[PDB]
Amino acid sequence: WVDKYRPKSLNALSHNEELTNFLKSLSDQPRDLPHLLLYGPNGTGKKTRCMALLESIFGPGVYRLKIDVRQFVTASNRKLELNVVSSPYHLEITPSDMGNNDRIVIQELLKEVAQMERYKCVIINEANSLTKDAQAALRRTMEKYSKNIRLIMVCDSMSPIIAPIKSRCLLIRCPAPSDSEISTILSDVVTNERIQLETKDILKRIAQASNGNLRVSLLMLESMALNNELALKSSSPIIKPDWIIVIHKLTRKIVKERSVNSLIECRAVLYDLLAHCIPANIILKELTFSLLDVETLNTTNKSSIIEYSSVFDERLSLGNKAIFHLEGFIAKVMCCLD
Amino acid sequence: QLPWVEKYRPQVLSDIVGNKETIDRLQQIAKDGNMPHMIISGMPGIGKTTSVHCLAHELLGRSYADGVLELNASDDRGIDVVRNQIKHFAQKKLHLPPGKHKIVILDEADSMTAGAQQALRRTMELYSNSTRFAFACNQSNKIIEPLQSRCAILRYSKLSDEDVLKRLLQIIKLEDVKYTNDGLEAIIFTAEGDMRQAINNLQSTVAGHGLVNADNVFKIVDSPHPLIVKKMLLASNLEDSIQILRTDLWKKGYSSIDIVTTSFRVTKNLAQVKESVRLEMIKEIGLTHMRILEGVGTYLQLASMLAKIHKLNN
Amino acid sequence: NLPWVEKYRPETLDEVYGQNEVITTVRKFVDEGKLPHLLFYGPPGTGKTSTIVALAREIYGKNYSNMVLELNASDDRGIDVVRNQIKDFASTRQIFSKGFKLIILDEADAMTNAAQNALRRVIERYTKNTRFCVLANYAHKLTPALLSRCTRFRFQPLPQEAIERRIANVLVHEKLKLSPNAEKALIELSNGDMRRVLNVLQSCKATLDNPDEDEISDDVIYECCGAPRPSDLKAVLKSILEDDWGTAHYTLNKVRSAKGLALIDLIEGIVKILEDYELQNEETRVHLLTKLADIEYSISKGGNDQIQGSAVIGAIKASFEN
Amino acid sequence: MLEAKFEEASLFKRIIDGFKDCVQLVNFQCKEDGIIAQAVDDSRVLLVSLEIGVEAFQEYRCDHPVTLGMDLTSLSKILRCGNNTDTLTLIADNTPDSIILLFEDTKKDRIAEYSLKLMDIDADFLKIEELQYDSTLSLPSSEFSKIVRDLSQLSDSINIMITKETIKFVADGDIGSGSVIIKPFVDMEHPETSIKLEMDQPVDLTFGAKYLLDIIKGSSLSDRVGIRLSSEAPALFQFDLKSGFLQFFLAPKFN
Amino acid sequence: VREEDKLWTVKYAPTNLQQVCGNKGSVMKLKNWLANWENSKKNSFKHAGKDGSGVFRAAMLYGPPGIGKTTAAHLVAQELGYDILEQNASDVRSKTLLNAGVKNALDNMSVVGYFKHNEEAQNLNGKHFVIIMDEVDGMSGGDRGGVGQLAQFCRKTSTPLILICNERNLPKMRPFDRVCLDIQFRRPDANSIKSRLMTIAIREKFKLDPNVIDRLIQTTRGDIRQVINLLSTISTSKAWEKNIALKPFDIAHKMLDGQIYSDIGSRNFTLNDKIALYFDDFDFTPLMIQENYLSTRPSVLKPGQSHLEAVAEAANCISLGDIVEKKIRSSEQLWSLLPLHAVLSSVYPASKVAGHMAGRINFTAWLGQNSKSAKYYRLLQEIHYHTRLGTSTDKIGLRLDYLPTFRKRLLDPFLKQGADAISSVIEVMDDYYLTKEDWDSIMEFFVGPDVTTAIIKKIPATVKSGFTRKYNSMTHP
Ligand SMILES: Nc1ncnc2c1ncn2[C@@H]1O[C@H](COP(=O)(O)OP(=O)(O)OP(O)(O)=S)[C@@H](O)[C@H]1O
Ligand SMILES: Nc1ncnc2c1ncn2[C@@H]1O[C@H](COP(=O)(O)OP(=O)(O)OP(O)(O)=S)[C@@H](O)[C@H]1O
Ligand SMILES: Nc1ncnc2c1ncn2[C@@H]1O[C@H](COP(=O)(O)OP(=O)(O)OP(O)(O)=S)[C@@H](O)[C@H]1O
Ligand SMILES: Nc1ncnc2c1ncn2[C@@H]1O[C@H](COP(=O)(O)OP(=O)(O)O)[C@@H](O)[C@H]1O
Ligand SMILES: [Mg+2]
Ligand SMILES: [Mg+2]
Ligand SMILES: [Mg+2]
């Protein structure tokens, strides 16, 4: 559904006319394209911009790409593998499957691709999960090979990137789509999908409740179209994912009851949420913002909430067993709210 | 000369002092003979190797030279060894009493490569009718999970104070040494459970200063003096503590790690202050230690540690 | 032609300074002939290596090239090295050797726990045909068994008299003049490591040898060492404690820029200065020490320099309010 | 317990070296009739049996039957020491944990006694029953060894055919193919060049090349090797000895 | 030769296929595959008969250690009357040695199987081979070219080739991706292990408390050999389970006591003694303290500090101790930090919230949750490896956003459209390279109001059968 209405060119883009104009400007120099560092919130379509730029420079056949697996041996006697999706002109490295061996794989793969000889494109996904050693190796690779490897790295909140890397690449940002433009894209979607709308207020409602995240907005429109039989009326009970509802029920249990007898069940809910492929930082952010949204608290309680949330977010980023820090944060929250 | 730790090493199982449960377990094992494969884990110098050696000796009697294969960190333990030599030793015919078995004693099992530990699996599973394996390790986490599960785990707690005191008193009585109670308490302090280190420090004190006295022990240990560190950690005004740490400890070339470790050890034994304040002082000293180990060892860190300890004590 | 660090290396037991308490002991050990396994440990630039090489050359004379084996840290140092090389050298008996060999392990604190266990087992096995000597900077990273197996020797830093005697001997044997405050600043900045002294001396020699007669002032010493002058420290502390925020910020910035000052060493000097003030209250000292230690710990991870500078200024100012 | 005295020490050396490459651990059942041994290959495809009666021993005295299970690499390392003109002697004590091998020189006092540590093996002793083999033949051992060493250089399988009093060996590899045929005949001038043949059913079997290359090493024991082939049963290769026999049971391949 | 001097694991080993406790389904699958391997060979391994288990040549066993994989394989091979040619880690399984030894016996027949019994009509498979490659995961660095040669042995073979490993999803075991069938042995449940332990105990003339048996089965984490070996220690009776077997339970009981941290009790039990109590077992003490530190009625509360503040400070110190443990395990050579960890994770929270135990001491559950998280992360990584070609997201945003609507499109038609929507469902399944196992995995990752394990079976089984038989006809890649 969503992927069926994904643009495949800079002209097919229907958002951020400034950004598409600047990319049309940059695509005028296929012989000299500096390194790019795209940064912006999740679901803004930075990968769409990158693939459209690639389609503008190279042929439109860049979108039919094949997956491949590559296994290599490290300095020690461990032989580990990764999966790269490659195209006739570019390859996408995602140093996320591997835990601490980012530097060796990035070094080896870049040095191997940089001896194929008109250049090649390397798309680095999740450029914030790179250890500083891997980042330094990447910068030295950029320093050595500059005529075959033109790096384009997408990321969000580009604080964990050392200034030695920011200097070489062109910093490009992708602001979230405004509610008006989200509503426009939703209207185009429902028009090309002949969805029977009762009014246009549902589109603005979804744009507002989506918090400027384009892809989750489109996906929740998809999810709601299959619950109203393609006839979206004004009485639409907006559908949230399962984990958001679980986190909101946890927030309501925290607010309504403040005791260890409820902290046990809170730890149980945290265990059940974590064991089903959900990060710790996402749970912490959602729980903090949900607790801040509650209207029964004053300003001092909210200040204590945000301070403890910051402290335990730092501790989560420093630790390894997330359940401990999550239980500690919830215990301190229950203490302050008591 | 001769090291006391080597001269007075227990050869009979009954002479071992320390854990009362596992030594009786091994006593009953030697009494019966049906010994299973066993990993023996615990902190250094608490009687791991001597235990298994005495067990093998008492279990096999006159056939120890022919029915025991020992492998320590010195001998080569790779893939070829575990495949050829251990396998040819397990199959070796040997007529022993009905309950006994050939013994393979692998000391420092942690250094054995995981790939090398793989080969031992079927070799010890198949020939369990005439061969038993005894691993001796410090940390039972570096042993692969199969070997971890095939054998019985035997944990050895660190030595208490009364057991080390009894052993040291036995050694003194056997050696006719002049001593005093404060010297023995200082030995217990500088040992913290290491029977080997306790005996060696005792022998070094006796050889160097003749009489076992507090100042002699604290001059031969080359560690910061516990009394002066206690005075530092218990001074009323902060400037006195800072001056003590500056002039009496920092000038004489002591390593910051040693200062923090001595402060930790003396704060553990301050049986005059309350329990909660002791725990909080230990927390502060440990945070300072963790800061020191991360690469920074400036005097300012120890100064801040003393400042926070005083702030807690106020 | 060779640097002074390699040239002025001692060759006899007499040419070592500030270590008499250990020199008399090693002379007793060499005249007795009962030399056991030794552990030499202490801060760098003290003379452990020089002392042990001189002792070996004295005990074995010309046979030094045969009965003395020197090994260093991490020479492909798996368990295989301790199994082959050290074990062969220890076990193998020479053709015409009387006594015992000597294996000196330099900077041998970088050994893993398994390597140290192999080494302790080896030294336990062949303790009758050879003696070992282990050198270390930190005696807390060694297994207590290996420590207990040998006799310890801590190398206290070189006192002022020893370093002054050594720099005098270097001065009379070279074409250099040294001003009275020069040696004072030298001893204050070196903290007692002879190697750094012998390095900085030839450095400032090659630096200011324009007419072969220039005097080494404290400026060139502070430049070559890269350490601030106490006057600048007093001035910046005065500006922080007296002036307002903007002027103090500009003063700190210019002092740390025009001279190249790191916040770590600046904080070290500032707390050294504040250590001797007559503070009337106590909470000021506690808050000052705590905040400054926090600043140093945060700097240890490389944050934003200007933010840590402003935080230093704020801590120093808000501490002095009683 | 047992005392066995060989006449020539080279005999047992050749016996051991004949099949020391097909079995790593063998069991020697010492009875009063002599020495009997059987051992299965590590892949359970090639069995080896060995019989040596009392006639091959100058003096053989066994108190009661026993089982000496020893290695072959160590036994070959030991047997490689003694010279040819010696008097090998095998001795074992009660409850034998080790066997003693004495090497005595007839005209000297140079006695060299070696000790060997016996191994422990589960006695998976299967009993062999005589079967009426369809094809029974005998041919010079050198001829068979040459034929195997020539054919094995092509593939990993060799096909044997017995049809209308004709022997045939066939090999088909990727580098080519080869075939040899043998006609039975006899010569009064030298009976050591005759190829006997007694066929009851024309048989077609296929065997592995490596196993035949390991078997043909027994050509140093005797000169006339016998072969018994059946339609589906394992083939029997026999080398006769002055007092016994060495037999290789080989398992055929599948179609 | 003696009935007693043998170990308790070898003496009580299973003999039939009804004594193997747990994993009955996988045992039956292996047995039904080995029995029909003959007809699979007759059909040239191209007709997947009724289970999709007719095309594969080699069966692969994997699972946690101490479940019966080796025993199940040997007993399954023996019941059918085969002949077991077994090779394990203790043999040099290099490429050249495998080509020499085993490869030449992939199609040959057995001599011992022939001579053992061939006259009475018991079974016709008395002479065939069943090659068991045990501990293929254990191929160390000294076995070069082993995994690839065994992957090649999976194909082109002529006899049943069973393979045993401990970690299927290890990268080294990748060449076994689709060339062999692979079944999984899960950790057996408490009921079967309890029945087996009861049989053993009554057979050995000694009885135990069922609660102690439950605590044992919990501590050993499902390993049957481990619990049997630990039970054999009873002969050498509260001292046994108090000191040796159930040590972490007693550590937690002693530490959470309220009388120790009191001034009267502290003078008798020093803090050094509590640090030694921790050092008794430094692998399970932190988890045990963290699991049940908030289930006791306290008695050391300060005059003005309620229970919630105490538990909050305890959790704060627990987080600090977790950070310290991570710093320790970052470099083992920093074991000097071990006493500090002792006070942070172990001593401080206990001293803060000590008192009297309300109920019973529950064993730690973080291990099972960690294992479940690892399994679900592996499954999600596989799903992303499949679906990345047409989604343009990361491995974590997938579960966050796409999984709810994917589950809707894949299931909700089965609730309202009945059974004719399969042609549509597979259509969606044909756009994202998903399979039936991928469909199950997608259906699994759901918690809250959208639980699917209850709903899944409500649909008619006829719909499931039709969907399975209709997906078998087409294939997207
Ligand atoms: N309980 C004990 N009673 C008497 N002596 C003991 C005891 N525990 C240790 N020792 C002494 O400590 C010495 C050191 O040997 P072990 O304790 O066997 O060393 P270890 O326990 O194996 O520790 P390692 O080798 O560093 S892992 C022994 O020779 C004994 O003299
Ligand atoms: N006590 C001393 N007396 C005289 N010169 C010394 C003394 N200590 C060091 N030196 C000089 O400084 C040089 C370095 O000495 P080293 O023995 O290498 O120091 P170190 O004790 O080995 O410390 P390291 O190697 O950094 S751990 C020597 O070659 C001498 O020139
Ligand atoms: N289901 C079971 N019921 C009873 N005993 C069992 C069971 N599974 C294993 N055992 C015991 O474990 C012994 C054999 O261990 P296995 O579980 O077969 O080893 P494994 O399954 O190959 O696991 P590894 O080799 O450590 S990876 C048997 O003799 C029994 O004592
Ligand atoms: N200009 C646009 N017009 C229509 N759809 C868009 C546009 N920009 C982004 N999208 C949609 O946003 C979705 C998510 O973008 P994506 O690059 O996957 O975000 P992320 O960077 O989080 O992976 C895409 O599926 C795409 O269809
Ligand atoms: Mg030991
Ligand atoms: Mg040195
Ligand atoms: Mg197994």
User: With b meaning 16 or more CB within 10 Å and e meaning fewer, what string describes E405-419?
Assistant: bbbbbbbbbbeeeee
Q: Do B91 and D119 touch (CB under 8 A)?
A: yes
Min Cα distance D118 → chain B (Å) is 6
Structural domain tally of chain D? 1
Both C302 and C198 in a single domain?
no
C-alpha distances in angstroms, B270 versus B222, B278, C170, E73, E271?
Answer: 21, 8, 51, 61, 10
- For ligand 4, atom 17: residue with the closest CA: A45
Angle between helices A260-274 and E307-330 (to 10 degrees): 30
Both C68 and C140 in a single domain?
yes
Q: Which long-range contacts (CB under 8 A, 24 or more apart) does E249-254 make?
A: E249/E215, E249/E288, E249/E361, E249/E363, E251/E277, E251/E278, E251/E280, E251/E281, E251/E284, E251/E285, E251/E288, E252/E285, E252/E288, E252/E289, E252/E292, E252/E361, E253/E357, E253/E361
User: With b meaning 16 or more CB within 10 Å and e meaning fewer, what string describes A139-148?
Assistant: bebbeebeee
Pocket of ligand 1 (CB under 6 A): B 5, 9-10, 16-18, 44-50, 138, 167, 195-196; C 145
Most E CBs within 10 A among B27, B86, B118, B266, hence the mutation to make, goes to B118
- Helix and strand totals (H; E) in chain C: 17, 5
Min Cα distance C24 → chain B (Å) is 15
Min Cα distance B2 → chain E (Å) is 31
Beta pairing partners, D105: D86
- Going by C-alpha positions, the residue among C279, C311, C276, C306 that lies closest to residue C293 is C311
Q: What ligand is nearest to the CA atom of residue C138? A: 2
Q: Is C264 on the interface with B (CB under 8 A)?
A: yes
Instruction: Tell which one of A15, A48, A125, A154 to mutate to probe ligand 4, the residue whose CB is within 8 A of the most ligand atoms.
Output: A48
d(C-alpha C141, C-alpha B307), whole Å: 28
Q: Do B92 and D95 touch (CB under 8 A)?
A: no
Please write down the HEC assignment for all residues of chain E. CCCCCCCHHHHCCCCCCCCCCCCHHHHHHHHHHHHHHHHHHHCCCCCCCCCCCCCCCEEEEECCCCCCHHHHHHHHHHHCCCEEEEECCCCCCCHHHHHHCCHHHCCCCCCHHHHHCCCCCCCCCCCCEEEEECCHHHCCCCCCCHHHHHHHHHCCCCCCEEEECCCCCCHHHHHHCCCCEEEECCCCCHHHHHHHHHHHHHHCCCCCCHHHHHHHHHHCCCCHHHHHHHHHHHHCCHHHHHHHHCHHHHHHHHHCECCCCCHHHHCCCCHHHHHHHHHCCCCCHHHHHHHCCCCEEECCCCCCCCHHHHHHHHHHHHHHHHHHHHHHHHCHHHHHHHHHHHHHHHHHHHHHHCEEECCCCCCCCHHHHHHHHHHHHHHHHHHHHHHHHHCCCCCCHHHHHHHHHHHHHHHCHHHHCCCCCHHHHHHHHHHCCCCHHHHHHHHHCCCCCCCCCCCHHHCCHHHHHHHHHHHCCCCCC
Query: Half-sphere exposure (CA, 13 Å, Cβ side) for E200?
Result: 25
d(C-alpha D93, C-alpha D99), whole Å: 8
Chain B residues with CB-CB distance to D97 below 8 A:
93-95
Q: Do E309 and A335 touch (CB under 8 A)?
A: yes
Instruction: Check the annotation: does B48 bind a ligand.
Output: yes
Domain final position from C131, C158, C185: C158
Cβ–ligand 4 contact at A157 (below 6 Å): no
Tell me, what DSSP letter sits at residue B82?
Answer: I
Domains of chain A with CATH codes = 2-173 (3.40.50.300), 179-232 (1.10.8.60), 242-337 (1.20.272.10)
Q: Determine the structural domain holding residue C298 and report its residue range.
A: 228-322
Chain B residues with CB-CB distance to D121 below 8 A:
91
- Going by C-alpha positions, the residue among B113, B106, B103, B110 that lies closest to residue B79 is B113
Chain D residues with CB-CB distance to E116 below 8 A:
126
Cβ–ligand 4 contact at A332 (below 6 Å): no
d(C-alpha D130, C-alpha D125), whole Å: 16
| Cβ neighbours, 10 Å, residue E200 | 16
Measured in whole angstroms, the distance separating CA B126 from the mean position of its chain's CA atoms is: 34
Three-state SS at A276: coil
Query: E330 near E296, Cβ under 8 Å?
Result: no
Cβ–ligand 3 contact at E14 (below 6 Å): yes
Instruction: Check the annotation: does B138 bind a ligand.
Output: yes
Min Cα distance C144 → chain E (Å) is 12
Instruction: Tell which one of B7, B196, B200 to mutate to probe ligand 1, the residue whose CB is within 8 A of the most ligand atoms.
Output: B196
Three-state SS at C63: helix
Chain E residues with CB-CB distance to A48 below 8 A:
392
- Going by C-alpha positions, the residue among A127, A190, A186, A189 that lies closest to residue A162 is A127
d(C-alpha B37, C-alpha E317), whole Å: 39
Give the pair of three-digit tokens for residue E453.
């394990």
Give the pair of three-digit tokens for residue B134.
């005894």
Both C50 and C151 in a single domain?
yes
Q: Is E344 on the interface with B (CB under 8 A)?
A: yes
Tell me which method was used to determine the 3D structure.
cryo-EM
Q: What is the resolution of this structure in A?
A: 4.0
- Going by C-alpha positions, the residue among E213, E263, E252 that lies closest to residue E360 is E252
d(C-alpha E172, C-alpha E166), whole Å: 12
Both C102 and C31 in a single domain?
yes
Residue C225's contacts (CB-CB under 8 Å, 6 or more residues apart) are: C189, C200
Interface of E with D (CB under 8 A): 83, 85, 100-102, 104-105, 107-116, 158
Q: What ligand is nearest to the CA atom of residue C143? A: 1
Burial bucket for residue E39 (CB in 10 Å: 0-12, 13-18, 19+): exposed
> Residues A151, A153, A158, CA angle at the centre, nearest 5°?
135
Instruction: Check the annotation: does B261 bind a ligand.
Output: no
Query: E215 near E92, Cβ under 8 Å?
Result: no
d(C-alpha C120, C-alpha B57), whole Å: 24
d(C-alpha D191, C-alpha D193), whole Å: 5
Cα-to-centroid distance, C193 and ligand 2 (Å): 8
d(C-alpha B203, C-alpha B220), whole Å: 11
Query: D48 near D58, Cβ under 8 Å?
Result: no
Instruction: Check the annotation: does B260 bind a ligand.
Output: no
Cβ–ligand 4 contact at A185 (below 6 Å): yes
Cβ–ligand 4 contact at A40 (below 6 Å): no
Task: Return phi, psi of residue E302, to 5°.
Answer: -80, 155
Chains that touch D (3 or more CB pairs under 8 A): B, E
Q: Do chains D and C touch (3 or more CB pairs under 8 A)?
A: no
Cα-to-centroid distance, E52 and ligand 3 (Å): 28
Residue E243's contacts (CB-CB under 8 Å, 6 or more residues apart) are: B21, E250
B47: left (phi over 0), alpha (psi -120 to 50) or beta: left
Chain D residues with CB-CB distance to E105 below 8 A:
43-45
d(C-alpha D61, C-alpha A310), whole Å: 91
Residue of B nearest to D73 (CA): B88
Chain A residues with CB-CB distance to E365 below 8 A:
271
The percent helix, strand, coil of chain B (3-state, each to 5) is 60, 10, 30
Burial bucket for residue D95 (CB in 10 Å: 0-12, 13-18, 19+): exposed
Pocket of ligand 2 (CB under 6 A): C 5, 8-10, 16-19, 44-50, 107, 137, 158, 166, 194-195, 198
Please give the biggest Cα pair distance in chain E. 89
Q: Do E89 and B122 touch (CB under 8 A)?
A: yes
The D111-117 sheet, strands edge to edge:
D57-61, D3-6, D86-92, D98-105, D111-117
Three-state SS at C98: coil
d(C-alpha A262, C-alpha A335), whole Å: 12
d(C-alpha D249, C-alpha D40), whole Å: 9
Q: Is C84 on the interface with B (CB under 8 A)?
A: no
Amino acid at E73: A
C-alpha distances in angstroms, B283 versus B266, B278, E260, E316?
Answer: 14, 9, 20, 13
Give the pair of three-digit tokens for residue A72.
């290599």
Three-state SS at A271: helix
Q: Do A67 and E388 touch (CB under 8 A)?
A: yes
Measured in whole angstroms, the distance separating CA E397 from the mean position of its chain's CA atoms is: 28
- What residue ranges in D41-163 does DSSP mark as E strands? 46-53, 57-61, 66-71, 86-92, 98-105, 111-117, 135-140, 157-162
Cα-to-centroid distance, C106 and ligand 6 (Å): 6
d(C-alpha C232, C-alpha A246), whole Å: 61
Residue of E nearest to B272 (CA): E267
Min Cα distance B78 → chain D (Å) is 22
Instruction: Report chain A's C-alpha Rg in angstroms.
Output: 23
> Residues B278, B283, B288, CA angle at the centre, nearest 5°?
125
Q: Do E134 and B122 touch (CB under 8 A)?
A: yes
- Going by C-alpha positions, the residue among B206, B157, B189, B165 that lies closest to residue B266 is B189
E22: left (phi over 0), alpha (psi -120 to 50) or beta: left
Dihedral (Cα; C192, C193, C196, C201), 10-degree rounding: 50
- What residue ranges in chain C does DSSP mark as E strands? 38-41, 68-71, 101-105, 130-136, 151-154
Burial bucket for residue D251 (CB in 10 Å: 0-12, 13-18, 19+): buried
Q: After which residues is chain E broken (C to N over 2.5 A)?
A: 236
Structural domain tally of chain C? 3
Cβ–ligand 3 contact at E71 (below 6 Å): yes
Tokens 């056949």 label which residue?
A61
Cβ–ligand 4 contact at A49 (below 6 Å): no
Strands A79-86 vs A170-173: parallel, antiparallel or unpaired: unpaired
Tell me, what DSSP letter sits at residue B72?
Answer: -
Query: B284 near E340, Cβ under 8 Å?
Result: no
Both C73 and C204 in a single domain?
no
Nearest to B295 among C282, C285, C300 (CB): C300
Measured in whole angstroms, the distance separating CA E170 from the mean position of its chain's CA atoms is: 14
- The domain limits of chain B are 1-159, 160-223, 224-314
Task: Return phi, psi of residue A183, to 5°.
Answer: -65, -35
Give the pair of three-digit tokens for residue E79.
């019941």
Min Cα distance E275 → chain C (Å) is 20
Both C217 and C149 in a single domain?
no
- Going by C-alpha positions, the residue among C65, C88, C64, C85 that lies closest to residue C75 is C85
Residue A307's contacts (CB-CB under 8 Å, 6 or more residues apart) are: none
d(C-alpha B313, C-alpha B174), whole Å: 46
Both C248 and C187 in a single domain?
no
Instruction: Check the annotation: does B46 bind a ligand.
Output: yes
Query: B11 near B57, Cβ under 8 Å?
Result: yes
| Cβ neighbours, 10 Å, residue B127 | 19
Both C130 and C218 in a single domain?
no
Cβ–ligand 4 contact at A184 (below 6 Å): no
Length of chain E: 477
